[PDB]
């Protein structure tokens, strides 16, 4: 719903990245909060440093018909979050239903 398929009738490469940023970024929002909820006690007496959470997003780019969603390089997409995710090698895996 969030996309409403604004890519289906138009070019996609430029804004597709823009689309996932809001999705990947908010995942990290709850990634730290749940860590924070469990680390509220002890007032971070030990291990005060905040570890980089792990994020994995499973996207299927199946196109209904006459549509070509643009898919970015996995590695290049992943490393864009260097310093926010531990698994910089891969943060999203793109697959098409067979």
């Amino acid at each position: 719903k969030r996309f409403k398929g604004l890519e289906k009738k138009q070019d996609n490469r430029q804004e597709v990245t823009k689309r996932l940023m809001q999705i990947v970024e908010e995942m990290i929002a709850e990634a730290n909060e749940m860590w924070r909820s469990l680390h509220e006690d002890s007032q971070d007496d030990e291990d005060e440093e905040q570890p980089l959470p792990l994020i994995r997003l499973k996207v299927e780019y199946s196109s209904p018909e006459g549509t070509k969603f643009e898919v970015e390089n996995p590695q290049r997409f992943s490393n864009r979050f260097a310093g926010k995710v531990a698994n910089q090698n891969d943060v999203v895996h793109f697959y098409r239903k067979k």
Binding site: P74, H93, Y95, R96, K98
Partner: protein
């Protein structure tokens, strides 16, 4: 006779060209199926 053999060139060359293209379809018919069945990581759709 020279004309006949000169177009014999074309016949054999055309014949040989017919065998090369079709095999790429056959072999490629077989290769795509095994790779799709065997690979499970899914980061590569198929190879030709």
């Amino acid at each position: 006779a020279i004309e006949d053999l000169g177009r014999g060139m074309a016949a054999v060359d055309h014949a040989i060209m017919q065998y090369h293209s079709k095999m790429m379809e056959q072999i490629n018919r077989t290769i795509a199926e095994l790779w799709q069945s065997t690979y499970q990581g899914t980061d590569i759709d198929t190879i030709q």
